[PDB]
DNA sequence: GGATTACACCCAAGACACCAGGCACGAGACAGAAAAAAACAACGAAAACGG
DNA sequence: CCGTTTTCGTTGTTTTTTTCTGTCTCGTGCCTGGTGTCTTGGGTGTAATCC
């Protein structure tokens, strides 16, 4: 064994030498990517205000306003409030939340409006008001009325108008970053098809089986129940194409990871999965053999279809399959799942939400919680695009640590290890603020610090290898 | 060792003050106690982290400690 | 209500107040700010009145009549750090579908509060003498709150 | 719910047979030490002719039903079902001859 | 002199540092007291045995071997301090 | 009462034992003791698994619950 | 012979353990765990038997093997 | 004449689970106060060795 | 049990700066609401044994 541990550890010295050549390489390729001229041209990012208006002319204000009461215009999303005989309009966007309190014969309703200082949950990027230190804001207005029923109806209608506005803004955002795609060109002959397929994410709240068709510039999923629930995916927009057979699964999978996100029903997604499920002493052993036949049948058919998709792409799309033997267990989201390496990506496709990490997009891997006799560790992927959030994989068993380190080395990904869960929300924002200064001071190559740098030890006893008495 | 050496000494003496009054301690007794205590607590925090991850969380809460001590067989 | 940012609202208030000599007023027998509720989850100001209790929350205001309080529980948590005050309310408080028949408040045991009751000496003597203290010294917040609830709802603290 | 032990002919609740076994046939059947399939194969809930025996030694009926060497209690004149071939061979190994009480053999 | 309530000498950073060595990222505020109680119950169980050994040897000083035997009795064998 | 049938457990025991030494004999009391110990162990394990499942705010026990319980006990590394 | 531990038996063991709902992989997981346990215990027992120069596995070997693991059993001659 | 009943099946509810929205209590950020920690020198109880 | 050596435990003081904290805003994850569809009950209804 001693000569094998010497051999294995010399291969581990080559592993460390590769890791050192990877840190030096990335340090050189961070100093070359960011120049001092880009640092001088620093871009200050400012909160964008979505401009809105209630009315342009006094004629636009409805004639129903004549009542000296709260009048709501759903068409213009406006809440006209009687302030000292003034028909003051308040857009539903400016409105925040409302509280109704029937005190005595009067119904006191306090309508709150957006005000800076831990206000709405909306991110800084989009502000419901224009930025202004010298701007004063109407924070709340309280009204009373003798008529309780109408005042309750008015409050319901304000709340409904806000819900409809928020829903429309979410629907817009789920279609916003989605790039306007070209139209799918139908195949003029009999298209190749895969029947009885489920799609994820589903276009409707009802799970329905559909048919997947191959066309000239993409694939089309089409539900038999409704023609309007078509999902078109262009070959140009597929980044990665995965197939996964039933090696342990109750299901077979064809997964399309996209370059640009698509709007399927109400959800924006980078991932579109097509799947089917197998699920429905010698007799029980024979029933397992019949399930193994049904697995092999669906595996063969879906693999063939995924190869036929790759062929139809004219060499734009390679068909990837997971290496199950190189798989490790971890928690990227909220469940423990088997993470599977492929040729070019780290994937999890069985449970939603899906994980697809492209290995080429990784800048550095950090192993958190790694120290003296630890039960488990976490793995963090940092991307070359610093605007992209870091990906965490939690609770990877410590038994898999040396395997994960080897695998990262075999893929040319630099890694570092730490006893503490470093915050990346902090690390990234500092790196985004000045990427050049970051690499100037040592980037991640200095942070690695592979050198043990330990010479203190614990002294030594009188060195005497001689029999005493 | 993460805990210091004098607050821990005072804690140990305070606890020992119940079983026999005015007891002396020895060179490597407090050190061994601190090593054992820290090893024990680190193992307990490992189990607590495992439970917290099991619950799909990242924050350890007292009920995770209680579950860990229940499964270990601790009273 | 206006929000005036910058270091500016005090100067704005002074000018307005001086213009028409506005006189400040004080209401609510007693108020307790920033109380942590476990159920409903959130932070609430508790304002107590002769006939009713108000819970003021950023998103939800509740008015509970003193008659609708059935039971008050004052229970130490087993962590020996927090103290629970629990109100049984009938009808149960509503946020939409499911309801809150029990309000669960969580105090720190080391949290001390000094509170003077907003009552005239004639009203205190006639209605509240032997039910409430005129001033509570710097005692634990949960004790003061439990005594005030006992005095105003006439319910026994369990 | 009551079942009739095929071998001795006694009738007891099936759960009683499962939990405690046959008080008479346990020397050759091990009904308590047997699974539900063996309990069914040796105790049948389908039977006919409930019989109560007080004194096995002097009751001519017990001798006629060959239950004079068993515990007094509930017995069945006819029991639906017979012992399985494997259990028959196991009993023949012990040297005990099995006479069916199904009535089809006489 | 009697020692009174020295459990608070296990300050927040010791417990936090112990958690970080244990791999814990976010720590609830009720943990620190929880941990303190746990530690108390541990030490009281170990010390009661160490003292039992010390008193049986008719000694007045708690030695390292007493602690080692007390730990060994609980399946807590410790290398480095004798054995 | 024992919840496993006797003959299947005996066959399993003999199958396992045959991998260490051929022509081994077992007293019936040895099999009975093994069955008692195995069921007691499995019931304790199922109690810990149920505790883990309830901790995760669920009702259905899952293989990950078993693995977590066995890891926390100190049985799997 | 590991298929002799049927699904109803595992269900019964879980019901005596208080388990209300059971996944479908629990059965295979339990079979694996039981196999590991039995492997260790029978290995220890056979070690005891071989040392005693016997060809029959007694109840004393099982009892000492359980005492070795820490699973002390009463009522079998211990 | 009379009655309780077996038996298949429909219309329906309780339950563990999945998905969505939002509000607050925690993390992140920054400037400030605190005492744990580090370093120093002195005295001698008591641990390790011997007959 | 009694006498010896000399380590390291107890005693006290000065200085440093990492850790604790007061304060703010934002967000992410805890909790309430809407919904799935399965296992099962309670019932109708057709049909029947029993004396
Ligand atoms: Zn019988």
Curated annotation (Swiss-Prot), chain B:
Where does the record place the modification N6-(2-hydroxyisobutyryl)lysine? 5, 20, 63
Tell where it localizes.
Nucleus; Chromosome
Result, substituting residue 58 to L: In BRYLIB1; uncertain significance
Consequence when changing residue 53 to V: In BRYLIB1; uncertain significance
Q: Look up what happens after changing residue 2 to R.
A: In BRYLIB1; uncertain significance
Origin superkingdom? Eukaryota
Q: Which residues carry this modification: N6-acetyllysine?
A: 20, 56, 63
Q: What is the effect of changing residue 18 to N?
A: In BRYLIB1; uncertain significance
The answer to keyword Nucleus applying to this record is yes
The modified positions for N6-succinyllysine read 20, 63
Q: Which GO terms describe its biological process?
A: cell population proliferation; embryo implantation; male gonad development; multicellular organism growth; muscle cell differentiation; negative regulation of chromosome condensation; nucleosome assembly; nucleus organization
Question: Which family is this protein grouped under?
Answer: Belongs to the histone H3 family.
Q: How does it assemble?
A: The nucleosome is a histone octamer containing two molecules each of H2A, H2B, H3 and H4 assembled in one H3-H4 heterotetramer and two H2A-H2B heterodimers. The octamer wraps approximately 147 bp of DNA. Interacts with HIRA, a chaperone required for its incorporation into nucleosomes. Interacts with ZMYND11; when trimethylated at 'Lys-36' (H3.3K36me3). Found in a co-chaperone complex with DNJC9, MCM2 and histone H3.3-H4 dimers. Within the complex, interacts with DNJC9 (via C-terminus); the interaction is direct. Interacts with ASF1A, MCM2, NASP and SPT2.
Annotated protein name in UniProt: Histone H3.3
In its UniProt entry, the species of origin is given as Homo sapiens
Q: What is the lineage of its organism?
A: Eukaryota, Metazoa, Chordata, Craniata, Vertebrata
Gene that this sequence comes from: H3-3A
The part of the entire sequence present here spans 61 to 135 of 136
UniProtKB/Swiss-Prot annotation, chain E:
Associated disorder:
Tessadori-Bicknell-Van Haaften neurodevelopmental syndrome 1: An autosomal dominant disorder with onset in infancy, characterized by poor overall growth, microcephaly, hypotonia, profound global developmental delay, impaired intellectual development, poor or absent speech, and characteristic dysmorphic facial features, including hypertelorism and abnormal nose. Other variable neurologic and systemic features may also occur.
Q: Where is this cross-link: Glycyl lysine isopeptide (Lys-Gly) (interchain with G-Cter in ubiquitin)?
A: 72
Family membership, please give it: Belongs to the histone H4 family.
- Positions of post-translational N6,N6-dimethyllysine modification: 1
- Kindly list the positions at which N6-glutaryllysine occurs in this protein: 12, 40, 58, 60, 72
Q: Which organism is it from?
A: Homo sapiens (Human)
Name it. Answer: Histone H4
**One biological process GO term for this chain?**
chromatin organization
Q: What job does this protein perform?
A: Core component of nucleosome. Nucleosomes wrap and compact DNA into chromatin, limiting DNA accessibility to the cellular machineries which require DNA as a template. Histones thereby play a central role in transcription regulation, DNA repair, DNA replication and chromosomal stability. DNA accessibility is regulated via a complex set of post-translational modifications of histones, also called histone code, and nucleosome remodeling.
Instruction: According to the UniProt record, list the residues that bear Phosphotyrosine.
Output: 32, 69
Cross-link Glycyl lysine isopeptide (Lys-Gly) (interchain with G-Cter in UFM1): which residues?
12
Instruction: Give this protein's Gene Ontology molecular function annotations.
Output: DNA binding; protein heterodimerization activity; RNA binding; structural constituent of chromatin
So which domain of life are we looking at?
Eukaryota
Carrying N6-butyryllysine, the residues are 12, 25, 58, 60, 72
Result when mutating residue 13 to R = In TEBIVANED3; results in early developmental defects when expressed in zebrafish embryos
Effect noted on mutating residue 21 to H: Found in a patient with a neurodevelopmental disorder; uncertain significance; results in early developmental defects when expressed in zebrafish embryos
Which parts of the sequence carry N6-lactoyllysine?
A: 12, 58, 72
Concerning PTM, the database record says: Acetylated as part of spermatogenesis progression prior to histone-to-protamine exchange. Demethylation is performed by JMJD6.
Parent-protein start and end of this portion: 21 to 103 of 103
Q: Quaternary arrangement and interactors, per the entry? A: The nucleosome is a histone octamer containing two molecules each of H2A, H2B, H3 and H4 assembled in one H3-H4 heterotetramer and two H2A-H2B heterodimers. The octamer wraps approximately 147 bp of DNA. Found in a co-chaperone complex with DNJC9, MCM2 and histone H3.3-H4 dimers. Within the complex, interacts with DNJC9 (via C-terminus); the interaction is direct. Interacts with NASP; NASP is a histone chaperone that stabilizes and maintains a soluble pool of Histone H3-H4 dimers.
Keywords, A to Z, come to: Acetylation, Chromosomal rearrangement, Chromosome, Citrullination, Disease variant, DNA-binding, Hydroxylation, Intellectual disability, Isopeptide bond, Methylation, Nucleosome core, Nucleus, Phosphoprotein, Ubl conjugation
Using the record's annotations, give every residue carrying the modification Phosphoserine.
Answer: 28
Q: Name the principal localization, coarsely classed.
A: nucleus
Residues where N6-acetyllysine occurs? Answer: 12, 72
